């Protein structure tokens, strides 16, 4: 699918607000993928011990992990579409190491819109929400292209 130059520039203006503070954001992100479906923690064995949002709050490498996930997410959002070579590692990864299916890249999909919903109203209104709902969709359907290749379609 392609975006328009519009919906790219909804998307990198909200992405900037985010820039400002990556490693709260990455936390909220994480903390609400866990909190709204619980089975996704299960895939994580270095985090799979935390019991409450509190644990998950002063974990230091549960930030680390946000902040290296955001940073790769952003990336990819940058290269408005022209993120093939970003996307190889990344999906030979989550398809052969972690095993991520398709459906726990919709939840964190989810959790990621309802971040920025709750924190950057005035930069997140419909039109733009529906830009980046298209940016992830666009992400999950070459990542699920990228999966088939490798032999995993998740
Ligand atoms: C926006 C989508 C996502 C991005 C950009 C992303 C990015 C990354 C990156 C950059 C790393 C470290 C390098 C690597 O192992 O490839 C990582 C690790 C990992 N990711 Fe993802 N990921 C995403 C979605 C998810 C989801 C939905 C799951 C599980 C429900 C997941 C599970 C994991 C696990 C288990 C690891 C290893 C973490 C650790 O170091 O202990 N990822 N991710």
Known sequence: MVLSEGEWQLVLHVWAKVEADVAGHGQDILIRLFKSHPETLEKFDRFKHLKTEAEMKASEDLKKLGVTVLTALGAILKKKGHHEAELKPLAQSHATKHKIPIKYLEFISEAIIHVL?????????????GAMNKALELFRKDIAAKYKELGYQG
Do not use: V
């Open 117 to 129: 919903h709750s924190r950057h109203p005035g930069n997140f209104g419909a039109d733009a929400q």
